[PDB]
Amino acid sequence: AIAGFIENGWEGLIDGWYGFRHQNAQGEGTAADYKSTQSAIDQITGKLNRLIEKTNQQFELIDNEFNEVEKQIGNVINWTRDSITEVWSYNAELLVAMENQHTIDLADSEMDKLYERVKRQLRENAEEDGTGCFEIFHKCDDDCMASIRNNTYDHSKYREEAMQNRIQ
Amino acid sequence: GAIAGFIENGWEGLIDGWYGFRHQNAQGEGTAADYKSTQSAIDQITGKLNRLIEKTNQQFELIDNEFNEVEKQIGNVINWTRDSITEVWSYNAELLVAMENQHTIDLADSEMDKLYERVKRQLRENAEEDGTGCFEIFHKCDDDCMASIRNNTYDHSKYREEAMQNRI
Amino acid sequence: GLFGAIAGFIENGWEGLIDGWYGFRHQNAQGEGTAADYKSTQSAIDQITGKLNRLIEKTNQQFELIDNEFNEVEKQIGNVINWTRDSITEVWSYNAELLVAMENQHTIDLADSEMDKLYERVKRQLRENAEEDGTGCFEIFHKCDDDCMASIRNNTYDHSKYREEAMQNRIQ
Amino acid sequence: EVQLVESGGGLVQAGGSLKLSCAASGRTYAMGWFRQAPGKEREFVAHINALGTRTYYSDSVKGRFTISRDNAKNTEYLEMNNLKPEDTAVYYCTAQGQWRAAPVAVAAEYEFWGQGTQVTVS
Amino acid sequence: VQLVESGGGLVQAGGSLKLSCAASGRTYAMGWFRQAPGKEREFVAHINALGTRTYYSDSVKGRFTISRDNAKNTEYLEMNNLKPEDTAVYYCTAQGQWRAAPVAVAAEYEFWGQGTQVTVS
Amino acid sequence: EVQLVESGGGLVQAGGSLKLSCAASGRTYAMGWFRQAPGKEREFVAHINALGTRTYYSDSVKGRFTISRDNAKNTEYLEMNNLKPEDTAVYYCTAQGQWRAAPVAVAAEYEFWGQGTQVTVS
Amino acid sequence: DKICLGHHAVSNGTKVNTLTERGVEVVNATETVERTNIPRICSKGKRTVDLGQCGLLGTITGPPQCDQFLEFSADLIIERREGSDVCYPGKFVNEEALRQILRESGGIDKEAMGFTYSGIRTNGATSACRRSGSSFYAEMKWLLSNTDNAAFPQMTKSYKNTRKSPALIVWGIHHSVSTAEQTKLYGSGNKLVTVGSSNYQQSFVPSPGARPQVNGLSGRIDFHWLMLNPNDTVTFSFNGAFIAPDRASFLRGKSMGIQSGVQVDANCEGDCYHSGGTIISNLPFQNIDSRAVGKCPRYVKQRSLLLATGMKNVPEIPK
Amino acid sequence: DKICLGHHAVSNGTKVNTLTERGVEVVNATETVERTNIPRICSKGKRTVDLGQCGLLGTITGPPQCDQFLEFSADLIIERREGSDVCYPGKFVNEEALRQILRESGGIDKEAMGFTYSGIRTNGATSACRRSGSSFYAEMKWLLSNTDNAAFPQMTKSYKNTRKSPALIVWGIHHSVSTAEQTKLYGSGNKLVTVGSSNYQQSFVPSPGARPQVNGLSGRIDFHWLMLNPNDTVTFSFNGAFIAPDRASFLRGKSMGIQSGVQVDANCEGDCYHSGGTIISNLPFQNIDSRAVGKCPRYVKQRSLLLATGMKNVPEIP
Amino acid sequence: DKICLGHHAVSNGTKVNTLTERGVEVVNATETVERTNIPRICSKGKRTVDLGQCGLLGTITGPPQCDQFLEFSADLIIERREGSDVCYPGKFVNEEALRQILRESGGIDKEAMGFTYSGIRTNGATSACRRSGSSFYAEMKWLLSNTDNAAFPQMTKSYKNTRKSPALIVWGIHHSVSTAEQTKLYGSGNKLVTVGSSNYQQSFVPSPGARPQVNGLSGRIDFHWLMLNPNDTVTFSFNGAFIAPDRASFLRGKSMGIQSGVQVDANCEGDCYHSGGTIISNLPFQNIDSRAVGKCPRYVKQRSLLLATGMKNVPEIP
Ligand SMILES: *[C@@H]1O[C@H](CO)[C@@H](O[C@@H]2O[C@H](CO)[C@@H](O)[C@H](O)[C@H]2NC(C)=O)[C@H](O)[C@H]1NC(C)=O
Ligand SMILES: *[C@@H]1O[C@H](CO)[C@@H](O[C@@H]2O[C@H](CO)[C@@H](O)[C@H](O)[C@H]2NC(C)=O)[C@H](O)[C@H]1NC(C)=O
Ligand SMILES: *[C@@H]1O[C@H](CO)[C@@H](O[C@@H]2O[C@H](CO)[C@@H](O)[C@H](O)[C@H]2NC(C)=O)[C@H](O)[C@H]1NC(C)=O
Ligand SMILES: *[C@@H]1O[C@H](CO)[C@@H](O)[C@H](O)[C@H]1NC(C)=O
Ligand SMILES: *[C@@H]1O[C@H](CO)[C@@H](O)[C@H](O)[C@H]1NC(C)=O
Ligand SMILES: *[C@@H]1O[C@H](CO)[C@@H](O)[C@H](O)[C@H]1NC(C)=O
Ligand SMILES: *[C@@H]1O[C@H](CO)[C@@H](O)[C@H](O)[C@H]1NC(C)=O
Ligand SMILES: *[C@@H]1O[C@H](CO)[C@@H](O)[C@H](O)[C@H]1NC(C)=O
Ligand SMILES: *[C@@H]1O[C@H](CO)[C@@H](O)[C@H](O)[C@H]1NC(C)=O
Ligand SMILES: *[C@@H]1O[C@H](CO)[C@@H](O)[C@H](O)[C@H]1NC(C)=O
Ligand SMILES: *[C@@H]1O[C@H](CO)[C@@H](O)[C@H](O)[C@H]1NC(C)=O
Ligand SMILES: *[C@@H]1O[C@H](CO)[C@@H](O)[C@H](O)[C@H]1NC(C)=O
Ligand code: NA
Ligand code: NA
Ligand code: NA
Ligand code: NA
Structure with a gap:
């Protein structure tokens, strides 16, 4: 028996982030979906490109490690630096937390989009089993499955056979 | 005595939960809370509140004087630095609250959608959406049948034949 | 593709839609027509306007000079000032870039959200009288004339009137 | 171009009320009201979107003023209750010519302006 | 609603202990706090109404396990690898309704137990 | 495993154009181009994702260079228009062997490298 | 018979930056960083x-x-x-x-x-x-x-x-x-x-x-x-x-x-000044002078940061 | 015959601010900026x-x-x-x-x-x-x-x-x-x-x-x-x-x-002090004193920033 | 007969933090805070x-x-x-x-x-x-x-x-x-x-x-x-x-x-220095020395901040 994304992820799916898993008379098979995989990767790559951008602003020493500067100016400096450190520590924590939330959400959105795409090609030829799978009401062989994956599946071809099976 | 779902409005009478069910049948009207969805929304918001309450361990000391004012030049530098920091935190605080509030509202109506879609899937071909966030069931569903929908033990194949005849 | 074929929003914008951000385009025996939807357009604009009201504003905090262009201040205090100012510039430059990127991400998403909501509303009123063609359109299984099309646009379409005609058309 | 004509301004006693109206000629979308007191800059007062479903107000004006519109008459309205001496100014109605998302309180974001109508509060 | 702590005692450093809180009435989110002499009440652990999520203090995380049984209307705190800084009076807490609030704030809980002494050495 | 071979480098006049190609033997996903001027570090130039649906460029190169690929021929291309004297360098094509989310401008993120082809701009 | 849902688009749109993509085209955008200076001192009412x-x-x-x-x-x-x-x-x-x-x-x-x-x-x-x-x-x-x-x-x-x-x-x-x-x-x-x-x-x-x-x-x-x-x-x-x-x-x-x-100008009014003149702007940021004083937009390193004021621009599929 | 999905609501809700809207009503909200001061110096344990x-x-x-x-x-x-x-x-x-x-x-x-x-x-x-x-x-x-x-x-x-x-x-x-x-x-x-x-x-x-x-x-x-x-x-x-x-x-x-x-108070304990007293708070921000010392919330200009702790409030139709 | 849609997963994934959850598992993550120091002064080209x-x-x-x-x-x-x-x-x-x-x-x-x-x-x-x-x-x-x-x-x-x-x-x-x-x-x-x-x-x-x-x-x-x-x-x-x-x-x-x-090192090239050596990193932050000079990543208090580079990890269960 096979189950979709609603219930669980697939630890056996390779060469992709998202994919298809089918069940028919010929047997069981699993194949990755490139369009969905590429889309999620593109967005995360965009985040990583932003992350490694470096400042061109140079900073020099304004205090001294060997001979301590005067106390008053020294306390102003230590207080200023600590305030800035507080600001960047907050930004860093917020940035990562914000981005991680968005990354998880965008990855889930790609899953939904893949699901909606397939549901639409299948039309009235299949029904949702509630676990992220489609029960197909006609005989769908490996070539028929391959046609669904590469978006050449024609619902009108199997429609009448499927609607008959659906009714009884 | 007609009833309507979330798309139309909220329920001021739902008391033991954030989300729930409201049904209409021969026995009468009834309302029941959904614990899983309610708990999930609360989980996300509490986690958010947990971050907010986290406290800094950074200590700050006095660098100026309330009783005897420090020298004017260093005093103006201090006041200028502190006010700049105040601007940054005022911006962060304003942005943080606005950002979080947008997210909280979105996650809350997002939990509503998941509950709606889950019910739609278990009902299968036995019901239709009335456009107000409700399902019109095309077979006879009594209090026990309604309870089966709420606790996710409803079997669509049992009422399928009756419902398909009534629908068509 | 085919002669006089129309397609929806999925992977496709309409460069000919002029009196709105969102709209309807229909196909029937009388011909083709296109009309904007004001409610959805106004809604998207309201959200972006709300965003702009918050963003396009400057502080009421005043700042004065702490150094001098004509006669340079003493070297040590001058370096502390320059170091502090540059640190602040780094913070705001970072905030500004992050803010704009963050808002732009949200603006694009909310715009696609209004499209979906309009799509879902129409799907809800049409009921069992139509099917989704997968490109953002509905194939209607009954005769829908200009008046019928208008009823779909202004949310007064009654599915019960055309249901039996439509359901037979779907079955055979 | 769209033409805007203000009317309904006048002298009035403190605590009294007044109703301004703006007659437009041409297609208007989002509209609003600005005012200018002598020697000052044009100040935002109120904004209504193209459909009249949403309104915005200044903090000094909120709760006392009501902006509204009639798309049949192509007209805009500003109902001013509980008038105060600081409300004394020349009031301008403003309008945008297309669907647009822009900050409501910024004068430059409106391309069509009226001649103005004087409002004086004793 | 009434809360009753039990299971406190003396125990050796590195040893383990199991506390239990018996509730009478409907409880939702629950938790554990502790108080050492001359100190303020300190958050220890929190479990939500359904028992699907748990929260711990940083000084406590990884060593303690909080759990609940809604059938017995009971809460549990499993304390493994105990150390001397764990010595305190322990209180179980409960909320009477659905609530979104920071778990580490004592004021956010309306129901408190009487307390049970735990001594580690 | 995967081997990359550059071709199409040469001498060229300032403002002129040139087109580089990378022939791969083996499975490639995301690919890119780097360049190195004498005595300097390898510098990012362009990146194309595995499907060829999205491209990235360095700021000094954007608007002048175009990266493309043919997955049937297992080939990568870099079309260089409006060449400048600072474009003079050895150009390397790069490739990743699996699906990967990584910053495109980092050389270490690519495990397969060509030997390079000289481009001299006069 | 068919009814379709869609959104508007333009032949050439403005490029902006997002969290996940650089230079994505949108129907419209507005600047957030002020570069325009008024080369006078705006002193009206002062x-x-x-x-x-x-x-x-x-x-x-x-x-x-x-x-x-x-x-x-x-x-x-x-x-x-x-x-x-x-x-x-x-x-x-x-x-x-x-x-x-x-x-x-x-x-x-x-x-x-x-x-x-x-x-x-x-x-x-x-x-x-x-x-x-x-x-x-x-x-x-x-x-x-x-x-x-x-x-x-x-x-x-x-x-x-x-x-x-x-x-x-x-x-x-x-x-x-x-x-x-x-x-x-x-x-x-x-x-x-x-x-x-x-x-x-x-x-x-x-x-x-x-x-x-x-x-x-x-x-x-x-x-x-x-x-x-x-x-x-x-x-x-x-x-x-x-x-x-x-x-x-x-x-x-x-x-x-x-x-x-x-020069001084008694006819324009402003609140943000630098040695080169007055910054009169509603924008939150500016790239003119880091030492500007008064009530000013915040100084940033970037010359331009475009904020989207419209949806993503999606070209129409050829007929 | 009919089953409906819905969410709770309240007659009157709290107004908060979001990224796209000012003053939107939610079921509940909490303050993030501390304004409450203890007019004493809490020195317990010090x-x-x-x-x-x-x-x-x-x-x-x-x-x-x-x-x-x-x-x-x-x-x-x-x-x-x-x-x-x-x-x-x-x-x-x-x-x-x-x-x-x-x-x-x-x-x-x-x-x-x-x-x-x-x-x-x-x-x-x-x-x-x-x-x-x-x-x-x-x-x-x-x-x-x-x-x-x-x-x-x-x-x-x-x-x-x-x-x-x-x-x-x-x-x-x-x-x-x-x-x-x-x-x-x-x-x-x-x-x-x-x-x-x-x-x-x-x-x-x-x-x-x-x-x-x-x-x-x-x-x-x-x-x-x-x-x-x-x-x-x-x-x-x-x-x-x-x-x-x-x-x-x-x-x-x-x-x-x-x-x-x-005045000094040896009975209460605190970590954030200013000339007017002690700031004892779990809130991340404060609008009391910008020159507070110790371990303090960050000073901000705003008196109030309400954080939503509940969903959007949508009233029920009669 | 049946076709399913799904996503990849791993037995044990990296824990990261989000706005609403602490320690949620993702398929993969990367560090954003630099802790690695080079104990030499990299002076190439200087x-x-x-x-x-x-x-x-x-x-x-x-x-x-x-x-x-x-x-x-x-x-x-x-x-x-x-x-x-x-x-x-x-x-x-x-x-x-x-x-x-x-x-x-x-x-x-x-x-x-x-x-x-x-x-x-x-x-x-x-x-x-x-x-x-x-x-x-x-x-x-x-x-x-x-x-x-x-x-x-x-x-x-x-x-x-x-x-x-x-x-x-x-x-x-x-x-x-x-x-x-x-x-x-x-x-x-x-x-x-x-x-x-x-x-x-x-x-x-x-x-x-x-x-x-x-x-x-x-x-x-x-x-x-x-x-x-x-x-x-x-x-x-x-x-x-x-x-x-x-x-x-x-x-x-x-x-x-x-x-x-x-000691000085003529073989490596760098731009960020402190008393302990040279920081060579693409990461935006560092936790090595708050007084580092040159062109440096920003100093932060946290030693580690993991950024998710993959989807949420949901283990497969029979
Ligand atoms: C101004 O200063 C004078 C002197 O410094 C103050 O007068 C003194 O007041 C004290 C107490 O009232 C007396 O004991 C002294 O004898 C006074 N000295 C003189 C010279 O008069 C005076 O009080 C101050 N005024 C204010 C308003 O502070
Ligand atoms: C400093 O003094 C030198 C020499 O006195 C000045 O240089 C002269 O400038 C004048 C003005 O153009 C020329 O006519 C001379 O031929 C220059 N002489 C030399 C030797 O350079 C210089 O201008 C003075 N600078 C300042 C700031 O006072
Ligand atoms: C985006 O919005 C701006 C408004 O800021 C539009 O600017 C107008 O541009 C046209 C020429 O294209 C001018 O004739 C108008 O005067 C401008 N309006 C204003 C208020 O200055 C711009 O056209 C919009 N772009 C799109 C594609 O809609
Ligand atoms: C100071 O002198 C004492 C005794 O002469 C000696 O023990 C100590 O080491 C000296 N310390 C320093 C720092 O010279
Ligand atoms: C500043 O901090 C450093 C390290 O924390 C310390 O050594 C130095 O004495 C401080 N400066 C002053 C003036 O206290
Ligand atoms: C899609 O798969 C079917 C089934 O093998 C095949 O006949 C067809 O050529 C494929 N189309 C494309 C574009 O790969
Ligand atoms: C700094 O600010 C404080 C409080 O705002 C004020 O009392 C003091 O006079 C200022 N210092 C200088 C040197 O202006
Ligand atoms: C679900 O509800 C039905 C109807 O009352 C009941 O028979 C069944 O035991 C319930 N199952 C669970 C797990 O509560
Ligand atoms: C501070 O920076 C300004 C402008 O870059 C420069 O003219 C001045 O000399 C600097 N001050 C010091 C003390 O280096
Ligand atoms: C909706 O359109 C129909 C068909 O033109 C029309 O009869 C009806 O009056 C319209 N309703 C509204 C509210 O405009
Ligand atoms: C609303 O939230 C506050 C916390 O700010 C809480 O004290 C109050 O009990 C809540 N009210 C309701 C009705 O949930
Ligand atoms: C995860 O990402 C890292 C980069 O941070 C990479 O080196 C590694 O190969 C990836 N895969 C696994 C299984 O960790
Ligand atoms: Na990519
Ligand atoms: Na020296
Ligand atoms: Na003293
Ligand atoms: Na202050």
């Missing part, structure tokens, strides 16, 4: 003083170039590069702190301190401060011995601030070219000046020595200052080399001070 | 010293109001507005730097420097420093000639810091009201005081003159200080007008200093 | 000077330990803890301001000031500045009377800056241990030194007195400095106790200065 040849510190001591400003009132003060604080060669000690105090003073109000003298000359003058002849600082008095090399008596002068706001007090120390010249002006012997208040305590000694000539003069006058609290007294003890204050200063209210090389 | 009339710098020199604080130990130091560092009129050079050193000192430990004198008066006193009669600074000595107008001998005194931590050393230069008065106390002639260490060398000449009366005296004292490294010596060379140290100071450990005008 | 025993301020006056650096050129300057600015005991006034000026100088260019003397000894030397015997600062001159206890002439020297950039000018004031030695070097009587420019005027008097012995010497030299603007003149008036400059200094261009305790 009492503006253009100091010109007068230096800000000069308004306190009163060289000839600062005569029309000895009691100025302003909301906005404008310093110029050609401004000078002095006539007789010298400088203010802690000069920048004082400038900062005066930039936000709102102008100054001068009151006589009531010092009277006996057995000395109070009419010391120089050709450096030419005011229809040899003169001196309008607010100061150059105290000398009656005759050359005559003894300067030991004196004590005190002043009480009987006003409600603090008083700005300024005095000068004269540095002669030689010990011999100092003896000629104030008599022989060591010269000492002590200045005291409730919260201020300092002493000053002149340092006679050869200096490079400025406008032909090798002497120097160094100005010092303190803030005298209400109902407090300042006491001056001196036996020579002392430039005494004639009037004390009081701050009027609140103002803004800027340094600029551009 | 060794607290309330200086009162004693000024912080007074603990080093020892005026009468600072006798009970000459060797204090503390975790928390509290200055008051009525505090005074002096009895005899005078001032510290680099005073604020010294205050900052002392605020974080953890208190001070005093050690005798072992100075002995011969042929001079060491009992210099004034009615300004009332200690059961005319007195002087408890840790200082006012050195005088035996008789009026007598020559003050040229003297040299040295002290070696033999502890592990640096030693705070303070001395004074006396400025008489007149040249005559200076001569009366220390004899005629030029007066010079030289202070020397391994890393410090300065010279001082008294400047006799009239100053405004503070506590009835027109004379002034200039207090100077240095930090003396371990195993280093400070040498005092002087011919008059010298206020000599009797004891040196040593910093105990670590502390924090605050300035306040409100 | 003109590097390692001062060693030489102190930065020493490069202007020229003690023996600074001879190979009197006219150095650099992009990167490295100070060491064992560095010393002096040979004969003393210190620079406003020392730290001068160090900052020199750290960014790009090196110095020395030009002769053209001072000539007659009837005077210019060869004053000491065993503290030992160069195969008694010597002195390479850029300074110790002026003496011709014979012991002989009167030192009254002198006046002037120098005009005819270059386009400001000139760094340094001079010294000698503080003898006693009046007797001061008399031996410069003759009896009061000794006065005056330094004057267009914007500077000050006087200095030697203060004979006992100081603790440093290098067996109780005397001190006070180094003072000013910046002489182009076309300006400095005037020196003195009758003794004056250490005269022989050469003025000019700043070459642009550089950055660091303080470090680790």
